[PDB]
Design an enzyme around this catalytic site. Structure first.
Site, PDB file in Angstrom:
ATOM      1  N   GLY B  30       0.776  -1.225   0.000  1.00  0.00           N
ATOM      2  CA  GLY B  30       0.000   0.000   0.000  1.00  0.00           C
ATOM      3  C   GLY B  30       0.811   1.280   0.000  1.00  0.00           C
ATOM      4  O   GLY B  30       2.047   1.241  -0.046  1.00  0.00           O
ATOM      5  N   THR B  31       0.098   2.412   0.051  1.00  0.00           N
ATOM      6  CA  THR B  31       0.691   3.757   0.081  1.00  0.00           C
ATOM      7  C   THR B  31       1.704   3.893   1.222  1.00  0.00           C
ATOM      8  O   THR B  31       1.846   2.995   2.052  1.00  0.00           O
ATOM      9  CB  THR B  31      -0.409   4.834   0.275  1.00  0.00           C
ATOM     10  N   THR B  32       2.421   5.004   1.265  1.00  0.00           N
ATOM     11  CA  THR B  32       3.383   5.188   2.334  1.00  0.00           C
ATOM     12  C   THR B  32       2.988   6.326   3.265  1.00  0.00           C
ATOM     13  O   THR B  32       2.236   7.222   2.893  1.00  0.00           O
ATOM     14  CB  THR B  32       4.839   5.393   1.774  1.00  0.00           C
ATOM     15  N   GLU B  47       0.950   9.888   1.921  1.00  0.00           N
ATOM     16  CA  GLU B  47       0.737   9.987   0.485  1.00  0.00           C
ATOM     17  C   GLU B  47      -0.682   9.560   0.107  1.00  0.00           C
ATOM     18  O   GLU B  47      -1.197   8.588   0.638  1.00  0.00           O
ATOM     19  CB  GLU B  47       1.775   9.097  -0.207  1.00  0.00           C
ATOM     20  N   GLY B 162       5.048   1.395   4.237  1.00  0.00           N
ATOM     21  CA  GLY B 162       4.347   1.389   2.968  1.00  0.00           C
ATOM     22  C   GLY B 162       5.297   1.286   1.788  1.00  0.00           C
ATOM     23  O   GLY B 162       6.466   0.904   1.934  1.00  0.00           O
TER      24      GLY B 162
END
Lengths: 250, 244, 244, 198, 233, 111, 242, 241, 243
Positions: B30-32, B47, B162
């Site tokens: 996933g996103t960070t 993010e 992430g």
């Protein structure tokens, strides 16, 4: 969450065997030997205190436990399972008998109780049988001295003398030679110590051995005086010293 | 044999719990997001991949607040994160109700910790597919925490998780050396907006929207608040200016 | 979930048979043999103790013959532990019946109750069936002497003479050969012994490996009496019938 | 209250039960039958609390009939009454106890003897030659204590009753509108449709 | 691979995926198409109703949750009934207890949290249906996209179902256009019906086949079926 | 001891015309000898052309109305916006009232 | 094994699908909806000449204005009829009126997916889906005559005509042609009687087939054997007449 | 606590547990019933794998659910008991509330419902039983004969059979029972019954027991003799040809 | 057949694999620890290994303060270790409330072992991959060391060590006692007992520590506490002037 395990973990196999019970017994076979002899005026149970490290204090670990002041037990198999069984037993003894009749239960009954517990862990939902076999020895006013063995299957039988564990076969044989229906308590302790030596590999003294008896009433172990009917417990655990004394004249 | 990874709470022959480990994969994917602990507060930034132009900007908020003084940000399965926060919010209320004082960060951490560790005990449940960075200001200091699906969590100077977790970490390790005496709330906010930008390189294919929040004893008064408007732009630029 | 380890103890085989029951029956066929023979003036229960030792205590024993009521007794074949559980519930049913109607529980009613309990573990609950088979011997003022048999399937029946345990096949043929409707208790006692004697898996048949019980109506009284022969009494009746 | 009389003669049991049903100011019915047949040879009469009375009766009935079918046998009057006593004795310590008094009269086809049991709402059971519930005994017991003989024929029994019922109609304040009588013997239960002027 | 890890929702793939949830998603794509777009004053739902035979009716796909909120479904009809119903209560609870109208953005959170639960415990199954929620509350018009995975997103417009990719690219282009159709409802609808046809391919949206719903500033969420939409075909 | 009931006074009237109907009620709300409000609406419009008033113990009256109104709403939700005929509302209300048969809504209600 | 409510890689519920396969093996049942009423017909289908054909009940009355036909595992429909009847009556009690045909249907469909071994959402206790489909036919003042088809999936459709059972795909394509928005009650009865004859494995007669209708004036009635036998005859005639 | 779904659908639309439950019936002893014009008769076969029983006390194959209705079955005995019991209880309950004994159809409908419920409830397997329920409705003189099976389906028959070799015996009945003229005598009815059982029992004077139920709670079982007499005359009918 | 490896049921050999694998888990941290008894105190030492620079070193501990008098060090993953610690604190807090006196070390040890045994028998509960060592100065037994494992086993020691290089630390200490003939470090101050431990720790592991490589807990009459980076530093310095 929630125990989804509500079905049996012990079931019948095509051959007619109950897997988990067999396996539990196998586990008991690997356990350190232990035994019990029934004299005419007492009973003796003893086992070997197999230490896990010379840094461990083997006193802080009893393999022979008192269930009631006239009943003691010893085992072979899995230490933890024995421990909790001893607890459950000491309790069932109060809740199912002493709190109703005002006196401790007779050996066969308490044994029947322990057996019930073990039996349930053989059919109840989501559990494995206890991995132990016990030798319970006690004395009740109307049956005298007795000695029973309880298996993971929940079955139990009375004995004149017997042993379980690692070298049970060899020891059982050794007893069938030295046992007679005239043995005096002291004699059995002697025979006991002997049968026990054939199992022990290393040090054989009052520190690597644990031994207790079910004999006469010890009013010096009662804690109080004043009631004529209360004469003391028939279960005594032999001291580290008391053992050696009998080891010299071995 | 095998199959030690089909049921949750099972120990493999080496002592691992594969299902928990598989959960992590869901996180890294996933996103960070990051957390920077300043000298009297904490900053959370994350993010937000802008999939399309249909996504209303400034609306799909991802940072959450527990009580009034705690901020949580997580990477992985969004739903699981919310779930974990709902529990945290109840956990906190229960504490304030009984003890009056709003729940200490370390105490709050353990609450989430125990709750998460719990989902690795039974095979009737799936572990959490998220890592969480949360913290705030309490009676004695500011605390930053990061929680793993395994229920493991530790205190941090700075933390990230992430997609671009390594990038961020690198940037964080720098900050920790070039500011041994401490960073200020105002600083961290910018520094963070930067970290996100760089760490966005491992997912540069898509356009993103930034999101920051902070809890500074002096700047926010000890309460968790979001960074919007002017103060936000000042950090977006501070980044756009060093991204070149 | 757990579904993975569920043996499904209560399902039908493609041939309409109940796996566990069939297996439990198989289990029973290795148990000591127990025989029940009913005469015009009484019932005889005799069972063979499977495997023994020199140190085994035979006085303080009673592993296969249990007293349920004052007029009802049973012989067990199978897991003694299971047997005891059912026996105890049986002794309760008997007492409830008495407390409710001030009359002794009719043999069949008690037998049915127990069989139903067994049948239960057959149709629901996902637990293993009780690996036990019973031979019931009792008396009531409606049918007098009765002999019954119940197995793991929860099914039960009535007999003139029957056997459970190992070698029931051989034993039944022998019984079905020397049994006569006008027999007398002592003829049965003798028939029983002979049968066990010809189907044992041991060298010889000695007193220490036996259990004996008779429900006679001692002409000198007018009521019913249950006698569970003691080690000595078994030794005697063993020499008399000629087996020394 | 209502009238509940029972008398065990030589080879049978006789049950007399008032026919009136009063609800406060008016007499709603004068042809009520305060009895149920538990089995072909066992009869039960009852009096007490307005609703519990019939409900209890019919509940006991259903159970005895279910036992009969299940076992294809008739419980002895003794058994039936022990079962009824337990039922009453249980509800006495419950949230709302059944306030019913009963008379169980049956003929034991096994001992070939008639039997009469009296049980009050508390669960107090007693076997008797003759009994009554409520105020009924206060008038009839002296008569029965005097004229009762263990070997009376069913005919002498009915005459003795008729005598009690008359003393009840003379000294008792309420009009119970006469009684319905029934005989339980080796041949079952039958009603004496002629006591209004026998 | 997949074969061993899609047994149930409680299991994680070695790569970190949740197949059962993904499969649920697949039931959405196999579902009929529906679209949503909003201006700054209104929010519209245009859905294509599907039918079995020529003797069967076209299964309704628009559901009203309250006077200021509603949604459209893509997938398992029942699951939508369950969810819409749960949402109806949450709105109702809000009005009764706080005399407040439930924020569309909040209805989204609720749906998300409910769905999430059916993906972490044994025995359950993910909801096999996608939803588009529109509504006008205290902060204007709104439009949300709900995924059985538990992901709810706020947008200006969007579509789900089979071929939904057509209208989704169309609206992505027509953005700057409709987003300014404030004050004129008929426009947003025509604009929606224009995006809804971008995913057709079989037939032409007929009278008893098109379904349109609208809510906004002075319009209590209402549904239009049949002759009511004839003026848009 | 605690008394869960109170009396807020007021009166309501209902007359049915050949093709119309009226449901009136003063607007005074009291407590013993005091006036709590000189204007507290006691008659309501519940939709589907139904007016209702639960007079007696205020708290109970309001709870009932609120419950009935919300009942109408779901009647629409469950039966495709069908109109709740007045006779159906009546029957429905009976169930609402009798539901608290053993802890009554201390109100005389008219629709 | 695998969840009794799991999704296939196609986004379908195994048990629900397999449930549908079971219904395909049931007796055929057909319904025609017209402005003069709705007609329900079912193939009795005995499995032996000793079986008293009239004890076969595949067309039941849910209320005076609602009736329905079943197909597939008929035993599974008992509780559905029960839940249905109860719902209809209950509604009447609460509202002093007749339950709308669609409502009654939606209510029956609500049971449909209440199955599993512990699906987080309420208390769905029922180990599997219903192995039967229903054709609920009836009438109400708001939408007049209606015909509905309820499946174990929980979804329900309204049809102008519909057939379920072994000969459904065949008989359905049949209804496609035959149906028009202006048939009379008589036309429908014959039409149903006709299509049943085509898909039935047996030679249709007043003993292995059953008819019924629902008219606003007399509600749901089942056609007794005498009345039906006549329409069988009357049908044979109009078919031989060209 | 145990709810595992044991009875579920398979790819082809079958519920194997119910299917297999039926296989258990096929294995159970044979049972048959034929209805006359003023009576119903129930015949069943006694096994012979083991003999030395005590027929006095051993459970018989035809049970009374109430004074006017009987029930026989094929399959697992233990299971039949559970149903017999629920039926008898429901029979009394019904009399207690409706104040009238059950009608055979009703009592059948109830037993069938019980069976059906066990096909779609967790933690339980279906009843490996199939039954025949016969009797006369209260105050009615028209005979009733019904049959139920694990699936939960029931229906009435002029005559029917269940159990092992029920195919063979059903065939016998299909070309031996004229609905136009059903056995007009309690006599000729019991004959037709025995005749059919003889196609499978293979010489079983003691292996065949019949019961005759007539209007107004008139149920009665025949003794070996009365039956043996029927057998004796039926075997002569063949050799006189 | 092969599932007797996934849940806690016996194997054909009579083994419980899940318990065996649990023991494996206890070495996942690759940290070692040892405990020793003073004349009137108890000391535990455990390696503190902080890999990441982003971590706040003061939040990384495997030593817990169960009660005012009991200390417990854990060998195994941190989440399981914390789970175990929480339970242990609750158990100790409750015991006091119910019985009117502080829960003894060996008792809490037993109770924890019992709880562990339950996971050995019940199927839905998995074992905790940790080894708990409890220490304190019991008002009746003096300096105490009790350790429990995933098997549900527990015993009291004269001194003990746990971790990957467990056997080295053991044979090391083992020898020191055969030599000194007494079963405990004969010292009056705990500062010296602590030093003795850090010493034999190095002598066994063969490595040198800095003030941030250790972690030390000390138990004494009426109190158990952990030393700080500095309290430890002052300890390393003292052993620095002698070697």
């Amino acid at each position: 969450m929630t125990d989804r395990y509500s079905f049996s973990l012990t079931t019948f196999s095509p051959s007619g065997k109950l897997g988990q019970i067999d396996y539990a017994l196998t586990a008991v076979k690997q356990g350190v030997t232990s035994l019990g002899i029934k004299a005419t005026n007492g009973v003796v149970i003893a086992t070997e205190k197999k230490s896990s490290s010379p840094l461990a204090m083997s006193e802080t670990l009893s393999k022979v436990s008192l269930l009631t002041p006239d009943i003691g037990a010893v085992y072979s198999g899995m230490g933890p399972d024995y421990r909790v069984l001893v607890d459950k037993s000491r309790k069932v003894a109060h809740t199912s008998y002493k709190r109703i009749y005002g006196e401790y239960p007779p050996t066969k009954l308490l044994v029947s109780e322990v057996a019930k517990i073990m039996q349930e862990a053989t059919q109840s939902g989501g559990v494995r049988p206890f991995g132990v076999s016990l030798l319970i020895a006690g004395h009740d006013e109307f049956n005298g001295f007795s000695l029973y063995q309880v298996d993971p299957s929940g079955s139990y039988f009375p004995w004149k003398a017997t042993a379980i564990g690692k070298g049970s076969v060899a020891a059982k044989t050794f007893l069938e030679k030295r046992w007679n229906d005239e043995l005096e308590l002291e004699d059995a302790i002697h025979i006991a110590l002997l049968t026990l030596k054939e199992s022990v590999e290393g040090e054989f003294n009052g520190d690597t051995i644990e031994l207790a008896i079910i004999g006469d009433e010890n009013p010096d172990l009662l804690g109080y005086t004043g009631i004529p009917t209360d004469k003391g417990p028939r279960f005594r655990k032999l001291t580290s010293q008391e053992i050696n004394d009998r080891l010299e004249a071995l | 044999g095998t199959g030690y990874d089909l049921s949750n709470s099972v120990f493999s022959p080496d002592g691992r719990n594969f299902q928990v480990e598989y959960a992590v994969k869901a996180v890294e994917n996933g996103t960070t997001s990051i957390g920077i602990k300043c000298n009297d507060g904490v900053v959370f930034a994350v993010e937000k991949l802008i999939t399309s132009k249909l996504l209303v900007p400034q609306k799909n908020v991802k940072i959450q607040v527990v009580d009034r003084h705690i901020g949580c940000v997580y990477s992985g399965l969004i739903p699981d994160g919310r779930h974990l926060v709902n529990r945290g919010r109840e956990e906190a209320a229960s504490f304030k109700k009984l003890y009056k004082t709003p729940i200490p960060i370390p105490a709050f951490a353990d609450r989430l910790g125990q709750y998460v560790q719990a989902h690795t005990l039974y095979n009737s449940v799936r572990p959490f597919g998220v890592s969480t960075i949360f913290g705030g200001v309490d009676k004695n200091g500011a605390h930053l925490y990061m929680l793993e699906p395994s229920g493991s969590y530790w205190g941090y100077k700075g933390a990230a998780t992430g997609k671009g977790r390594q990038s961020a970490k690198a940037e964080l390790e720098k900050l920790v050396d070039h500011h041994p005496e401490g960073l200020s709330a105002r600083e961290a906010v910018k520094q963070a907006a930067k970290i996100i930008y760089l760490a966005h390189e491992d997912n540069k294919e898509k356009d993103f929207e930034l999101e920051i929040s902070w809890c500074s004893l002096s700047e926010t008064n000890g309460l968790h608040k979001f960074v919007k408007g002017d103060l936000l732009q000042e950090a977006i630029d501070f980044a756009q200016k060093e991204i070149n | 979930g757990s579904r993975r380890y569920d043996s499904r103890t209560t399902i039908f085989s493609p041939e309409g048979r109940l796996y566990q029951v069939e297996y439990a029956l198989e289990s029973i066929s290795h148990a000591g043999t127990a025989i029940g023979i009913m005469a015009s003036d009484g019932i005889v229960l005799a069972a063979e103790r499977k495997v023994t030792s020199t140190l085994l205590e035979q006085d303080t024993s009673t592993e296969k013959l249990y007293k349920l009521n004052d007029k009802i007794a049973v012989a067990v074949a199978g897991l003694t532990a299971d047997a005891e559980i059912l026996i105890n519930t049986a002794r309760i049913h008997a007492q409830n019946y008495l407390k409710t109607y001030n009359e002794d529980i009719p043999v069949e009613i008690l037998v049915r109750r127990l069989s139903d309990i067994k049948q239960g573990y057959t149709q629901h609950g996902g637990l293993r069936p009780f690996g036990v088979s019973f031979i019931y011997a009792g008396y009531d003022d409606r049918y007098g002497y009765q002999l019954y048999t119940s197995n793991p399937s929860g099914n039960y029946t009535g007999w003139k003479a029957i056997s459970v345990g190992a070698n029931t096949s051989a034993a039944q043929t022998l019984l079905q050969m020397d049994y006569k409707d006008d027999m007398k208790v002592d003829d049965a006692i003798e028939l029983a012994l002979k049968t066990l004697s010809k189907t044992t898996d041991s060298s010889a048949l000695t007193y220490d490996r036996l259990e004996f019980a008779t429900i006679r109506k001692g002409a000198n009284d007018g009521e019913v009496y249950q006698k569970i022969f003691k080690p000595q009494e078994i030794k005697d009746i063993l020499v008399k019938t000629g087996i020394t | 209250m209502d009238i509940i009389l029972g008398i065990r003669v030589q080879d049978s049991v006789i049950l007399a039960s008032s026919k009136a049903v009063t609800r406060g100011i008016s007499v709603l019915k004068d042809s009520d039958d305060k009895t149920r047949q538990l089995s072909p040879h066992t009869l039960m009469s009852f009096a007490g609390e307005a609703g519990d009375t019939v409900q209890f009766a019919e509940y006991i009935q259903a159970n005895i009939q279910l036992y009969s079918i299940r076992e294809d046998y008739e419980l002895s009057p003794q058994a039936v009454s022990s079962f009824v006593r337990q039922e009453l004795a249980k509800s006495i310590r419950s949230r709302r106890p059944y306030q019913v008094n009963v008379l169980i009269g049956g003929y034991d086809k096994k001992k070939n003897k008639p039997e009469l049991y009296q049980i009050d709402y508390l669960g107090t059971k007693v076997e008797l030659p003759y009994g009554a519930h409520g105020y009924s005994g206060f008038y009839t017991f002296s008569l029965l204590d005097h004229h009762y003989r263990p070997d009376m024929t069913t005919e002498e029994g009915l005459d003795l009753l008729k005598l009690c019922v008359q003393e009840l109609e003379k000294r008792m304040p309420m009009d119970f509108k006469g009684v319905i009588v029934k005989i339980v013997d080796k041949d079952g239960i039958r009603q004496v449709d002629d006591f209004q002027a026998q | 691979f997949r074969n061993n890890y899609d047994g149930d929702t409680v299991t994680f793939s070695p790569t970190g995926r949740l197949f059962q949830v993904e499969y649920a998603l697949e039931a959405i794509k196999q579902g009929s198409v529906t679209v949503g777009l909003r201006s700054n004053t209104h929010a519209v739902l245009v859905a294509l109703k599907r039918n079995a035979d020529e003797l069967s009716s076209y299964q309704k796909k628009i559901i009203k949750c309250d006077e200021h909120m509603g949604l459209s479904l893509a997938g398992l009809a029942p699951d939508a009934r369950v969810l819409s119903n749960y949402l109806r209560q949450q709105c109702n609870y809000s009005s009764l207890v706080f005399n407040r109208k439930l924020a569309v953005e909040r209805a989204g959170h609720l749906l998300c949290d409910k769905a999430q639960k059916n993906t972490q415990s044994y025995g359950g199954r993910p909801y096999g249906v996608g939803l588009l929620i529109i509504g006008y509350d205290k902060s204007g018009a709104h439009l949300l996209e709900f995924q059985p995975s538990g992901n709810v997103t706020e947008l200006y417009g969007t579509a789900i179902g089979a071929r939904s990719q057509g209208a989704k690219t169309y609206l992505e282009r027509t953005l700057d256009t409709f987003i300014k159709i404030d004050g004129n409802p008929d426009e947003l609808i025509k604009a929606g019906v224009e995006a809804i046809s971008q995913s057709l391919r079989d037939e032409s949206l007929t009278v008893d086949n098109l379904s349109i719903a609208i809510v906004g500033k002075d319009t209590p969420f209402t549904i239009y079926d049949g002759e009511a939409v004839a003026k848009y075909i | 001891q605690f008394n869960p009931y109170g009396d807020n006074g007021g009166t309501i009237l209902g007359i049915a015309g050949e093709d119309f109907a009226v449901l009136a009620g003063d607007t005074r709300n009291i407590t013993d000898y005091s006036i709590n409000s000189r204007y507290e609406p006691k008659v309501f419009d519940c939709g589907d052309n139904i007016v209702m008033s639960a007079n007696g113990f205020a708290a109970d009256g309001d709870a009932l109305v609120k419950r009935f109104k919300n009942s109408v709403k779901w009647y629409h939700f469950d039966h495709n916006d069908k109109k709740l005929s007045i006779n159906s509302a009546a029957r429905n209300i009976q169930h609402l009232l009798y539901g608290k048969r053993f802890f009554p809504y201390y109100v005389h209600t008219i629709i | 094994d695998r969840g009794v409510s799991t999704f296939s890689p196609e986004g379908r519920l195994f048990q629900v699908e397999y449930s549908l396969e079971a219904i395909k093996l049931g007796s055929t049942a057909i319904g025609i909806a017209t402005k003069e009423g709705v007609v329900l017909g079912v193939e009795k289908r005995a499995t032996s000449p000793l079986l008293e054909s009239d004890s076969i009940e595949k067309i039941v009355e849910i209320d005076r204005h609602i009736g329905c036909a079943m197909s597939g595992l008929t035993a599974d429909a008992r509780s559905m009829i029960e839940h249905a009847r109860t719902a209809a009556v209950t509604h009447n009690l609460y509202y002093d009126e007749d339950i709308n045909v669609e409502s009654l249907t939606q209510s029956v469909c609500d049971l449909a997916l209440r199955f599993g071994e512990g699906a987080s959402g309420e208390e769905r206790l029922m180990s599997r889906p219903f192995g039967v489909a229903l054709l609920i036919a009836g009438h109400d003042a708001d939408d007049g005559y209606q015909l509905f088809h309820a499946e174990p999936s929980g979804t329900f459709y309204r049809y102008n005509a519909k057939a379920i059972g072994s000969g459904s795909e065949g008989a359905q394509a049949e209804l496609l042609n035959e149906w028009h928005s202006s048939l009379t009650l008589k036309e429908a009865e014959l039409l149903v009687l006709k299509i049943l004859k085509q898909v039935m494995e047996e030679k249709l007669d007043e003993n292995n087939a059953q008819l019924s209708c629902i008219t606003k004036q007399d509600g749901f009635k089942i056609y007794d054997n005498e009345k039906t036998a006549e329409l069988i005859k009357e049908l044979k005639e109009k078919e031989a007449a060209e | 606590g145990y709810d595992r779904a044991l009875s579920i659908f398979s790819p082809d639309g079958h519920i194997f547990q119910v299917e297999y439950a039926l296989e258990a019936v096929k294995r159970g002893t044979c049972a048959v019933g034929v209805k006359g014009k003023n009576c119903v008769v129930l015949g069943c076969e006694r096994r012979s794998t083991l003999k030395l029983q005590d027929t006095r006390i051993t459970p018989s194959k035809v049970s009374k659910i109430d004074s006017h209705v009987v029930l026989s079955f094929s399959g697992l005995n233990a299971d039949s008991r559970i149903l017999i019991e629920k039926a008898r209880v429901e029979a009394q309950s019904h009399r207690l509330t409706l104040e009238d004994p059950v009608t055979v159809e009703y009592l059948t409908r109830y037993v069938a419902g019980v069976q059906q419920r066990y096909t779609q409830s967790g933690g339980v397997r279906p009843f490996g039983v199939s039954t025949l329920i016969a009797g006369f409705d209260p105050r009615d003189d028209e005979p009733k004969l019904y049959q139920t099976e694990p699936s939960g389906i029931y229906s009435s028959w002029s005559a029917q059979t269940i159990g092992r070799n029920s195919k063979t015996v059903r065939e016998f009945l299909e070309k031996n029972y004229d609905r136009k003229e059903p056995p007009a005598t309690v006599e000729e009815c019991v004959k037709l019954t025995v005749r059919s059982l003889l196609e499978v029992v293979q010489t079983g004077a003691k292996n065949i027991e019949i019961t005759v139920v007539k209007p107004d709670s008139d149920i009665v079982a025949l003794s070996s003799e009365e039956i043996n007499q029927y057998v004796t005359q039926i075997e002569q009918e063949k050799q006189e040809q | 057949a092969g599932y007797d490896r996934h849940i806690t049921i016996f194997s054909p050999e009579g083994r419980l694999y899940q318990v065996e694998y649990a023991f494996k888990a206890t070495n996942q941290t690759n940290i070692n620890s040892l405990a020793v008894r003073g004349k009137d105190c108890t000391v535990v030492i455990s390696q503190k290994k902080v890999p990441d620079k982003l971590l706040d070193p003061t939040t990384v501990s495997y030593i817990f303060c169960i009660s005012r008098t009991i200390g417990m060090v854990v060998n195994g993953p941190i989440p399981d270790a914390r789970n175990a610690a929480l339970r242990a604190k609750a158990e100790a807090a409750e015991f006091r409330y119910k019985y009117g006196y502080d829960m003894p070390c060996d008792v809490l040890a037993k109770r924890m072992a019992n709880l562990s045994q339950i996971y050995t028998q019940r199927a839905y509960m998995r074992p905790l991959g940790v080894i708990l060592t409890f220490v304190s100065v019991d008002e009746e037994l003096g300096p105490s060391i009790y350790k429990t494992d995933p098997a549900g086993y527990y015993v009291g020691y004269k001194a003990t060590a746990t971790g990957p290089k467990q056997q080295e630390i053991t044979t090391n200490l083992e020898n020191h006692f055969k030599k000194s003939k007494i079963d405990h470090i004969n010292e009056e101050s705990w500062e010296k007992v602590v030093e003795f431990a850090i010493t034999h720790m190095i002598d066994a592991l063969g490595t040198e520590f800095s003030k941030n490589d250790l972690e030390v807990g000390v138990a004494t009459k009426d109190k158990f506490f952990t030393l700080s980076a500095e309290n430890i530093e002052e300890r390393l310095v003292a052993i620095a002037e002698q070697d």
